[PDB]
Amino acid sequence: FENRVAEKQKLFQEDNGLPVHLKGGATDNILYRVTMTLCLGGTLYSLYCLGWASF
């Protein structure tokens, strides 16, 4: 392996106004959309389950 930290430092310090969780690129946006879709969807589902259980 070779030291590529400098390349990563350049990428993450690039003044594009992006928040650290999306500054890595398009994948961050794909990975963040997947974590958000599952979290909210799963919450809606838990609410539904609380309905079925309570009644």
Binding site: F1, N3, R4, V5, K8, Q9, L11, F12, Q13, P19, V20, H21, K23, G24, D28, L31, Y32, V34, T35, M36, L38, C39, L40, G41, G42, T43, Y45, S46, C49, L50, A53
Partner: protein, 258 residues
């Protein structure tokens, strides 16, 4: 700013993490009472994806953006020590439950410890091996730490690899011990204390090993400097904690209670 502290970018992980907690607890309830693991499965996936994305961002903020000034690093040190303290207190509750049940065996157990019908694992058999394994990994991780400080990449990786192999070895040994144990979690206040205490400990060993594996990869990628490597320090403090808890479990649960 003219202070050395870190103003963190607005982040979605605290929310995804909190929601994943709701999904896991909701999930456990659904599993225990409405025979379904769907909710539970979703909770565990979103916890791991929030945690990858939370710790990934911490690495980006420190190694890549330079936000970890000495002041920020000294706060993280206090944070990790405090976290470990709370983990110690958590285990203390389990030891309290063991030294309550053991030092006054109730008539249902025959009035003596170990309870009638219980045939404990010999302390000197596999449990002693587990003990040498963790103590040995405590030595190898110290070698890894010194290698890193001395700027020795190869030996740091070598020592760290050995530490991880040992943690895995312990995990495999414990898994095997669980399977061959003649007693189960449903066998009274002996099986209860034994499996819940060693079970939470085994969980911490898996968490600790994972933490060390993260360090191994970050090391492979040259993230650590010979002077700045808090992630490794935290992983090592956590590892020693896991080691010390084991020493208390072997002395009390096995040697004293067999």
């Amino acid at each position: 700013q003219t202070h050395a502290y870190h103003m963190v970018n607005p982040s979605p992980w605290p929310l995804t993490g909190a929601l994943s907690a709701l999904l896991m607890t909701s999930g456990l309830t659904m599993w225990f009472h409405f025979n379904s693991m769907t909710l539970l499965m979703i909770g565990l996936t979103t916890n791991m994806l929030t945690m990858y994305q939370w710790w990934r961002d911490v690495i980006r903020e420190s190694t890549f953006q330079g936000h970890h000034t000495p002041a920020v690093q000294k706060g993280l040190r206090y944070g990790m020590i405090l976290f470990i303290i709370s983990e110690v207190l958590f285990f203390t509750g389990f030891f309290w439950a063991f030294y309550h049940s053991s030092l006054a065996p109730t008539p249902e157990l025959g009035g003596c410890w170990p309870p009638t019908g219980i045939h404990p694992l010999n302390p000197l058999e596999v449990p002693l091996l587990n003990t040498s394994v963790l103590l040995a990994s405590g030595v190898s991780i110290t070698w890894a730490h010194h290698s890193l400080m001395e700027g020795d990449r190869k030996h740091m990786l070598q020592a760290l690899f050995i530490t991880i192999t040992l943690g895995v070895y312990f995990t495999l040994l414990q898994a095997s011990e669980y399977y061959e144990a003649p007693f189960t979690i449903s066998d009274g206040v002996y099986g209860s204390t034994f499996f819940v205490a060693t079970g939470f400990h085994g969980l911490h060993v898996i968490i600790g090993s994972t933490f060390l594996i993260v360090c191994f990869f970050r090391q492979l990628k040259f993230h650590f400097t010979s002077n700045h490597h808090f992630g490794f320090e935290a992983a090592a403090w956590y590892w020693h904690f896991v080691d010390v808890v084991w020493l208390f479990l072997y002395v009390s649960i096995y040697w004293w209670g067999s």
